[PDB]
């Protein structure tokens, strides 16, 4: 996260760290959506151009964390994966269309002050909140700049950008399964997600019922916090059909 701040304790209790078994290192962000299911970006797990293809046993999920490097005794929980599900039409060849994956944990995680699931949007919440200018929040332990790793979880609030501005900022083909967010050069403020923030959540707090909803997943960006460029996010609501199917038919 570029130009963000340190998170408050318990501010993002759905935040998950995808962690490599050997060598032990951060791979990606992720989110807790129930006691046994974790949501992330497909590219965190599968990305052939970079020879990335992880299997269940290559990985652990660490939940309830704040510190990036520290082992947070009596607070974080570490969970094994039972199974990984990647969207069958995830487009790693072109533009990361449908960049989404589900991970099922070997055993349920215990909720706590620091561990709690985020909501997934229904149609009406998505329609009300996914509007240009409305702000969401992105969290992660990724780079503080494109060249620089944080001591603790970082947070940044960013406004959704209108689809024509998103499209005109890039040569990549943008789809309905993505949205972009970030400030314009004219707007003054700045901030962005960056490498290592991948698969982490873009959340919004509904003013209707005061619950946090995950509207996006950190997916891709060209550099980080560059003027005139915007971060791109998987549109969770658009892919809800698949999420539900997987959990319905595998949970």
């Amino acid at each position: 996260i570029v130009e963000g701040s340190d998170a408050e304790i318990g501010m993002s209790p759905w935040q998950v760290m995808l962690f490599r078994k050997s060598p032990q290192e951060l791979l990606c962000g992720a989110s807790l959506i129930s006691d046994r299911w974790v949501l992330t970006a497909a590219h965190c797990l599968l990305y052939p151009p970079w020879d990335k293809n992880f299997t269940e046993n290559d990985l652990l999920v660490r939940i309830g964390k704040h510190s990036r490097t520290r082992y947070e005794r009596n607070i974080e929980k570490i969970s094994m994966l039972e199974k990984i599900y990647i969207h069958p039409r995830y487009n790693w060849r072109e533009n990361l269309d449908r960049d989404i994956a589900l991970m099922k944990l070997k055993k349920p995680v215990a909720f706590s002050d620091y561990i709690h699931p985020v909501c997934l949007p229904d149609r009406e919440t998505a329609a009300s909140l996914l509007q240009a200018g409305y702000k969401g929040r992105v969290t992660g332990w990724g780079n503080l700049k494109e060249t620089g790793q944080p001591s603790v979880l970082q947070v940044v609030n960013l406004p959704i950008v209108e689809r024509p501005v998103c499209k005109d900022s890039t040569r990549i083909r943008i789809t309905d399964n993505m949205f972009c967010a970030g400030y314009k050069p004219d707007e003054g403020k700045r901030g962005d997600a960056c490498e290592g923030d991948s698969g982490g959540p873009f959340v919004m707090k509904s003013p209707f019922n005061n619950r946090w909803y995950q509207m996006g997943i950190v997916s891709w960006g060209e550099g980080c916090d560059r003027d005139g460029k915007y971060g791109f996010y998987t549109h969770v609501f658009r892919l809800k059909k698949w999420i539900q199917k997987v959990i319905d038919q595998f949970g």
Binding site: S5, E8, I9, G10, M11, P13, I33, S34, D35, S112, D113, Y114, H116, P117, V118, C119, L120, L129, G133, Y134, K135, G136, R137, V155, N157, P159, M204, K205, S206, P207, N210, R211, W212, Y213
Partner: peptide
């Protein structure tokens, strides 16, 4: 889940975090 989206250390205690109001104010 019944309780999703309600943080134990914030909504469940009626405590606000330091910048959530920025989001609310953008929802015009």
């Amino acid at each position: 889940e019944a309780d999703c989206g309600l943080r134990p250390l914030f909504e469940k205690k009626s405590l606000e975090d330091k910048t959530e109001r920025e989001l609310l104010e953008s929802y015009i």
